Write an enzyme that holds these catalytic residues in place. Sequence first.
Site, mmCIF file in Angstrom:
data_model
loop_
_atom_site.group_PDB
_atom_site.id
_atom_site.type_symbol
_atom_site.label_atom_id
_atom_site.label_comp_id
_atom_site.label_asym_id
_atom_site.label_seq_id
_atom_site.Cartn_x
_atom_site.Cartn_y
_atom_site.Cartn_z
ATOM 1 N N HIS A 84 0.802 -1.216 0.000
ATOM 2 C CA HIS A 84 0.000 0.000 0.000
ATOM 3 C C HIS A 84 0.845 1.282 0.000
ATOM 4 O O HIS A 84 0.258 2.367 -0.011
ATOM 5 C CB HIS A 84 -0.998 0.001 1.168
ATOM 6 C CG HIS A 84 -0.406 0.380 2.492
ATOM 7 N ND1 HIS A 84 -0.100 -0.553 3.461
ATOM 8 C CD2 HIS A 84 -0.070 1.585 3.011
ATOM 9 C CE1 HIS A 84 0.400 0.061 4.518
ATOM 10 N NE2 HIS A 84 0.439 1.358 4.268
ATOM 11 N N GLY A 101 2.982 5.699 9.987
ATOM 12 C CA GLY A 101 4.363 5.609 9.547
ATOM 13 C C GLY A 101 5.077 4.326 9.929
ATOM 14 O O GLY A 101 6.203 4.099 9.468
ATOM 15 N N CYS A 122 4.214 1.199 9.271
ATOM 16 C CA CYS A 122 4.051 0.058 8.380
ATOM 17 C C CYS A 122 5.399 -0.372 7.811
ATOM 18 O O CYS A 122 6.305 0.443 7.615
ATOM 19 C CB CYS A 122 3.045 0.393 7.276
ATOM 20 S SG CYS A 122 1.376 0.435 7.981
HETATM 21 C C1 LIG Z 1 0.975 2.212 8.008
HETATM 22 O O1 LIG Z 1 1.981 3.092 8.530
HETATM 23 C C2 LIG Z 1 -0.316 2.375 8.811
HETATM 24 C C3 LIG Z 1 -0.152 1.891 10.263
HETATM 25 C C4 LIG Z 1 -1.369 2.241 11.119
HETATM 26 C C5 LIG Z 1 -1.532 3.744 11.315
HETATM 27 C C6 LIG Z 1 -2.122 3.891 12.719
HETATM 28 N N1 LIG Z 1 -1.689 2.689 13.417
HETATM 29 C C7 LIG Z 1 -1.246 1.773 12.540
HETATM 30 O O2 LIG Z 1 -0.782 0.689 12.814
HETATM 31 N N2 LIG Z 1 -1.361 1.616 8.139
HETATM 32 C C8 LIG Z 1 -2.409 2.299 7.692
HETATM 33 O O3 LIG Z 1 -2.504 3.508 7.818
HETATM 34 C C9 LIG Z 1 -3.515 1.553 7.022
HETATM 35 C C10 LIG Z 1 -3.431 1.761 5.516
HETATM 36 C C11 LIG Z 1 -4.120 0.655 4.709
HETATM 37 C C12 LIG Z 1 -5.607 0.563 5.027
HETATM 38 C C13 LIG Z 1 -3.971 1.026 3.233
HETATM 39 C C14 LIG Z 1 -3.488 -0.707 4.984
HETATM 40 N N3 LIG Z 1 -4.747 2.117 7.530
HETATM 41 C C15 LIG Z 1 -5.141 1.816 8.757
HETATM 42 O O4 LIG Z 1 -4.459 1.169 9.524
HETATM 43 C C16 LIG Z 1 -6.469 2.263 9.218
HETATM 44 C C17 LIG Z 1 -7.291 3.159 8.546
HETATM 45 C C18 LIG Z 1 -8.424 3.218 9.412
HETATM 46 C C19 LIG Z 1 -9.585 3.970 9.245
HETATM 47 C C20 LIG Z 1 -10.581 3.882 10.217
HETATM 48 C C21 LIG Z 1 -10.417 3.057 11.329
HETATM 49 C C22 LIG Z 1 -9.248 2.307 11.484
HETATM 50 C C23 LIG Z 1 -8.260 2.404 10.515
HETATM 51 N N4 LIG Z 1 -7.049 1.829 10.361
#
Ligand SMILES: *[C@H](O)[C@H](C[C@@H]1CCNC1=O)NC(=O)[C@H](CC(C)(C)C)NC(=O)c1cc2ccccc2[nH]1
Lengths: 306, 306
Positions: free
Chosen positions: A41, A143, A145
């Site tokens: 992603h 950040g 991920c």
């Molecule tokens: C990557 O850095 C990030 C890590 C997460 C951010 C907050 N805590 C984390 O572990 N991943 C993401 O931002 C995800 C991106 C996708 C969906 C493309 C894999 N998004 C989420 O984790 C995410 C989006 C949300 C929206 C609403 C409720 C919960 C959510 N989680």
Amino acid sequence: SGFRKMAFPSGKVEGCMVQVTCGTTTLNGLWLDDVVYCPRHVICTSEDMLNPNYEDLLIRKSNHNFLVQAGNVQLRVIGHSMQNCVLKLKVDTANPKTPKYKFVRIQPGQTFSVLACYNGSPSGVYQCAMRPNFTIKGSFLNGSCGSVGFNIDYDCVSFCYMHHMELPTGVHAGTDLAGNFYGPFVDRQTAQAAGTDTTITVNVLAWLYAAVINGDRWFLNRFTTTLNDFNLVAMKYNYEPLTQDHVDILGPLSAQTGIAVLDMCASLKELLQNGMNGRTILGSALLEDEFTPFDVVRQCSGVTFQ
Amino acid sequence: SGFRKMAFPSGKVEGCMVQVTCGTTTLNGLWLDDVVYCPRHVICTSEDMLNPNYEDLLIRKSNHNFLVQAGNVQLRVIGHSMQNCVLKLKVDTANPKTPKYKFVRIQPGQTFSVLACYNGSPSGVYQCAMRPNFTIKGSFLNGSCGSVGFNIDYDCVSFCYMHHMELPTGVHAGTDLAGNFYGPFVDRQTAQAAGTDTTITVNVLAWLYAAVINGDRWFLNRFTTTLNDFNLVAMKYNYEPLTQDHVDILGPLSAQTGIAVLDMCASLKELLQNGMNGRTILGSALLEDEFTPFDVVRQCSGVTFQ
Ligand SMILES: *[C@H](O)[C@H](C[C@@H]1CCNC1=O)NC(=O)[C@H](CC(C)(C)C)NC(=O)c1cc2ccccc2[nH]1
Ligand SMILES: *[C@H](O)[C@H](C[C@@H]1CCNC1=O)NC(=O)[C@H](CC(C)(C)C)NC(=O)c1cc2ccccc2[nH]1
């Protein structure tokens, strides 16, 4: 003596962490030999992330679109490809700090160390378990991920986890290093829920053995139980069934302490029905289920890693 | 989100760990530039350890009596000297992996990472607090002496702790890196007891802020209290007094959450008088006091280290 939630020394993995930036998105990559592994992603943008098509998105990318940063050295991408939910970026430099390593997928109930990273830079290390519902209770901010989970067996790093997302309950989901999610999750922003979890019975019992090895005995008793009568009590308390194989794995801890596995089960039964009456076990007021039999034998005996 | 007890990445310290063997005794040394630091009781034997005279014992030693092993490379001792309870062994090779570093002595209530080591080889990493009574609740087996505790500030390793001994209650005592014990302890096998401990109030409150930042709000309330009326309640529960300086340190967490420090104190007062009624805070059924305000801001904001 003492018992701490203890991570593997993180140095071998720190030397693999890099920063992967594509467009607006920056996350972490895992640099092994001449491939950087990162969550697919990274190729998204904020309106891509609702329901993206990653194959379509990837053919649109160019090698030079991926900015790979190893500390203060930029790595030249010379090839990209998708493997399930991870990207494999081929770079023109083998990582001289590549430890000996394996990609292994773990089972729920198993533990691993997480090296939380931001912008390619390690922030902290901590121990996690893969929950029965295939989430992990991590500590992860935007950040993070591409941070990875791992175990170390002598000199060899077995990577088991790549971080991808946080579920709405605040728990975390990701993939093995082949890009395959743990559990029924997708790297899309849709309505995803963790699913009901259970307590890992065999780990609770391993931790009771840790406590006996460390002087905490108040919860012991003369009673015993059959495996069948224990497992009736497990279901009632959302504990996972106990198998003869679990009883076997707990044999060395049974031998060391002289407490028959089924006797410890009788102790667990009473802790479940009576609670802890204001007492603590290894400094916890809850029954702890994120230590494996292996974790206990490792810590209570002194194994190291070269 | 999430909140874990999180250690510093251990790689910078792993590169400093060596094995020091003198006579029958093997322990860990810390190799920085051309000096290996290790606990002075390495020069002892089992009947030396009742009431030894370390000055007398050391003049009897020869440079070649100290076997210093850096992985599979033997280091030539060319000088030894005692500094309080540590030995400084000068070797004929500067450690090429010497990070930028400082020797700092911490205050009770502060935390640090411990890299448990055996035979010069790191075993695990975990977070500890210096308790009010100057012990730490570690995880340490025979052979772990010379393992060190540390914090990392950007790229700089501040060594604060060297392990020396276990007290009869299973808690641990050691020195700063200048060889000066934390607390009223000596590196002799005599009747030594830890001394009564207190709960670190400011850390409990920092951890309540961590929990609010992470979604746990059930323990909040509309009541408030004066610092004077809170501190009466602290004494009763063996909590340490709360100062205006603690209230200041908790300001950023107060600002972020909008919960006045004294309001959180009112919440702590009720948790102390009523308990938790079967509920949990950040996955703990006890009030947690081994996270500093710094630890919370670091984890709940995402600071890294290069
Ligand atoms: C990557 O850095 C990030 C890590 C997460 C951010 C907050 N805590 C984390 O572990 N991943 C993401 O931002 C995800 C991106 C996708 C969906 C493309 C894999 N998004 C989420 O984790 C995410 C989006 C949300 C929206 C609403 C409720 C919960 C959510 N989680
Ligand atoms: C050094 O490797 C070792 C570390 C401790 C062994 C068990 N857990 C530990 O942390 N230190 C020592 O063995 C100490 C040596 C001296 C006293 C010279 C500093 N000894 C003890 O820790 C020790 C001896 C005891 C005897 C009786 C009760 C408790 C004891 N602790």
